[PDB]
Symmetry: C3
Subunit: 220 residues, 3 copies
């Protein structure tokens, strides 16, 4: 029965080829087995419930419920920090609740109102208004739409609009895509207009804390 | 090889003489009062219909100098801290005609250009604050505001403000100011490319029309 | 007599220059003197608030020249020059400037909004006319200031600022003024590219420094 035997060297090389193929195929399914922590419309449906309250208590109760629903995915009270944001000609403030390489969640708004450029991200951005007014002017048009508390503005990837927030506008924001590339835009005016390097450090530290949380949760 | 430099500078001098004579003997396609009156006739119409009528009338008054509908594109413009949108109808190295405005209003720096700019308001308001002064002026639909070369002002467009702009001077120099916030504030390279492509299309049209 | 090591005398000279530089910096701080008191400019400007801003500016300039001869720029060197920074735009007229102090009339006829800037200096703004909305870092509310009031901005603090139409104020700043001028020309370089405004601003600083140097060296 010499025709049933298999040499050892050919078997070793064939198993190397087999593991090569298996690894090159199961690496692909990592994009097919993608798992987002939050559903796409879950953040909006969650924030639309707290829009009736004042934005302070609304933020507090929303953070409580978001920690209850996704334990180990929201930054603790020790690392929650309002930091300024200057980009595209507008200025607001953010408080980062969750931050990964594919997702981010943050409270965002302005107490004075601000106008400017929305930016062109490799990400989809949802903004659910808790208070105030939002004015969006889409590219190519000559008109603008207004959004009120409870409503959600969706901003697809690659799109560019003109944005205007009235006085005392506050919203939650969810972002799915290449988050670092968006962080590149959200710090342009901070570098070339405001020179507020302390704010740069604060935003980068918030991102680092979010990533540390998302990694320590994956390991425990 | 010492005479090669002499021949090079000789050809260069003759070419510069040709260029100087051509720049001096060049006429202008449009007139300031022409654009002003055309934009003033339509100021009572809704800005969409006014834009359309003005484009058709400019096409029939100067054929071969207005871009076709396939090359007409609205492009955002972030400059001097303000953000509007423009649609280029005509653009050479000495003139340009465009439609400008904003649906949200915007404030910022007018720019320090090497050119004279004329804006006839179709709709909205235009607040101009001149350098060295402590008060501002306001222009309403139908009126024209002139920004002279070397002048810098503060500008404020109210919500839903649209105008027709006619600029005359060293047009390539305004590109530095018009795209500064695009590079350092918005990082919108796609809009930068759209702007450069509109300029290139205008130059292509003018060249082919001059050559027939 | 004995020798010292190549690393021994090195650290010894390091400690020597440390002692020298520290005690010299302390001697410098000890001899530091200020032309204007911490609240002098505000107290003086509040007296002229409420009038027409032109008349208030003229009377305040006359009063400052009377109270501090040799520290206020002459009429031929007074000039309104635009300022673009942190996304906002206004106009300034410098009356006094050194490496540690400065005084200027500031304001806008259109109103503006933007980043106040994070300085190594304490800056007070006394309002002659208009409105001043301030949004402090870490808060979701804003404070409005009317003519007669003074807004103090501490070193290291960063706020969002908004001036209503026809807002005019007097301002006194104390600290590392060059660091403030670094921010004061950000949009002028990366946004407006108005090099003539940059020249006007730097020439005003040079004139203030020249007046201060002449008065320090020759009195009067
Ligand atoms: C309408 C609201 C403005 N929309 C534009 C959508 C049309 C952007 C708002 C935003 C603020 C702030 C942002 O961050 C400064 C930011 O980008 C997130 C990048 C980041 C930040 C910290 C940690 C991790 C990742 C985006
Ligand atoms: C109403 C105030 C705005 N006024 C200031 C002076 C009245 C300028 C508005 C403008 C916008 C946008 C402009 O171009 C983006 C622009 O310059 C046009 C030159 C160009 C550049 C590239 C391609 C074709 C033409 C000018
Ligand atoms: C937001 C309110 C503006 N508050 C900031 C206080 C938080 C500063 C106002 C200022 C404007 C503009 C300034 O410079 C243009 C400037 O610095 C003055 C120093 C100088 C500058 C040029 C020449 C000589 C001296 C200061």
């Amino acid at each position: 029965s010499m025709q049933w035997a298999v040499g050892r060297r050919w078997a070793w090389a064939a198993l190397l080829l087999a593991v090569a193929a298996v690894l090159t195929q199961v690496v692909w399914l990592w994009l097919g087995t993608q798992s987002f922590v939050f559903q796409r419309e879950e953040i909006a449906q969650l924030a639309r419930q707290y829009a009736g309250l004042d934005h302070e208590l609304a933020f507090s109760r929303l953070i409580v419920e978001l920690r209850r629903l996704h334990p180990g995915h929201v930054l603790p009270d020790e690392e929650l920090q309002w930091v300024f944001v200057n980009a595209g000609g507008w200025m607001g403030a953010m408080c980062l609740l969750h931050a990964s390489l594919s997702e981010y969640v943050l409270l965002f708004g302005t107490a004075l109102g601000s106008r400017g450029h929305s930016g062109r991200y490799w990400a989809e951005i949802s903004d659910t208004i808790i208070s105030g007014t939002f004015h969006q002017w889409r590219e190519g048009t000559t008109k603008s739409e207004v959004f009120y508390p409870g409503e959600t503005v969706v901003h697809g990837p690659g799109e560019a609009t003109a944005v205007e927030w009235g006085p005392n506008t506050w919203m939650v924001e969810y972002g799915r895509g290449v988050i670092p590339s968006t962080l590149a835009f959200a710090l342009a005016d901070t570098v070339f207009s405001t020179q507020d390097f302390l704010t740069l450090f604060y935003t980068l530290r918030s991102y680092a804390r979010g990533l540390r949380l998302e990694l320590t949760t994956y390991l425990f």
